[PDB]
Every structure is written in structure tokens, then in C-alpha cells.
Amino acid sequence: ELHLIPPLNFSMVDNGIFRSGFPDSANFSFLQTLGLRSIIYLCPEPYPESNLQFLKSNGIRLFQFGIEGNKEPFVNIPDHKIRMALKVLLDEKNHPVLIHSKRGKHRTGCLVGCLRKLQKWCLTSIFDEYQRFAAAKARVSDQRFMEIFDVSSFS
Ligand SMILES: O=P(O)(O)Oc1ccccc1
Numbered sequence: 497e498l499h500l501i502p503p504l505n506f507s508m509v510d511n512g513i514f515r516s517g518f519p520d521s522a523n524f525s526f527l528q529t530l531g532l533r534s535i536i537y538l539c540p541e542p543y544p545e546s547n548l549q550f551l552k553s554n555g556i557r558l559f560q561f562g563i564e565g566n567k568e569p570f571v572n573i574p575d576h577k578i579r580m581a582l583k584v585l586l587d588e589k590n591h592p593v594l595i596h597s598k599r600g601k602h603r604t605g606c607l608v609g610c611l612r613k614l615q616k617w618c619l620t621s622i623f624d625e626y627q628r629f630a631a632a633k634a635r636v637s638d639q640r641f642m643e644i645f646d647v648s649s650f651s
């Protein structure tokens with residue numbers, strides 16, 4: 497009975513932290529197995545009724561930090577929104593937490609890369625993980641955002 501379907505680009509980031517693209521009803525039975533307390537949602541669009549009923553049924557808190565989905569070379573990742581998401585991500589009371597965007601590549605990739613910088617990973621190691629998810633859609637601007645991200649306020 498091969499029946500569980502993780503959401504698009506699903507991965508475990510760390511103890512209590514997951515990343516993916518946008519979950520749909522086919523992914524709900526899999527997400528139930530994780531015992532989520534929180535979702536960090538990085539798109540501005542309203543959450544669909546299907547997903548809201550999943551959250552309500554499972555007692556999952558929704559944190560929305562809407563980042564516009566821009567394309568290179570006109571990408572302007574908002575530092576403030578990433579930092580608000582990081583503040584929630586670093587509070588273990590919110591774990592287990594799923595970070596998701598639409599595809600789990602750009603917005604999700606930036607938030608995870610900034611977590612890795614706080615975890616003292618080498619930039620080349622952060623970029624390698626970012627590229628594994630983003631694949632042919634890897635953006636230099638996402639990696640430059642991580643390069644210049646000042647960790648001072650979170651250490
Ligand atoms: O910002 P996201 O993680 O949703 O990732 C993408 C990547 C390519 C196109 C749209 C979205």
C-alpha cells in the first residue's frame with residue numbers, strides 16, 4: 497500500500513523543520529504523519545479552503561509572510577519578510593514547522609539558506625543545498641541575498 501504523497505520538493509531541513517512547495521489534498525495524509533504545529537507560508541495569495549480545513553482539523557497555526565514571486569533580473573527579495581519568517585522558524589515552540597511557497601525553490605530556498613548561515617555553514621555549502629532544490633530555476637539573486645544577509649541580529 498504505497499499511498500503517502502509528500503508535497504512538491506518536500507525535504508526535512510533539520511529536527512522539527514521541513515520545506516516544500518504548495519501542499520494539495522493529495523499530500524494531507526502524508527503531512528498528518530509529521531504532527532505539524534506550524535506552517536510558514538511565503539506567498540501573498542489567500543490560503544485555499546481545502547488547506548484551511550486541513551489546518552483547522554489538525555490544529556496547525558498558519559504564519560503568512562507574503563513575498564511577491566518576481567523573475568530575474570528584477571528580483572527584490574524583501575529582507576524584512578525573510579527576517580519575520582526566521583524569527584518564527586527559530587522558536588522551537590512552533591516545531592514541527594513546514595516552510596512552503598509555490599514551488600519550494602526561491603522564497604523557501606532563501607529562508608532556508610539564511611537559517612544555514614545562522615548555523616555557520618560555509619556559503620558554498622548553503623548555495624549547493626539551494627541549487628539542489630532550485631535546479632534549472634536556480635537564481636544568482638537568491639544566492640547573493642544569502643551572501644549579503646547580515647546575521648548580527650539573530651546570533
Ligand atoms: O518562490 P518559490 O519557492 O515558490 O519558487 C518558484 C520558482 C520558480 C517559479 C515560481 C516559484
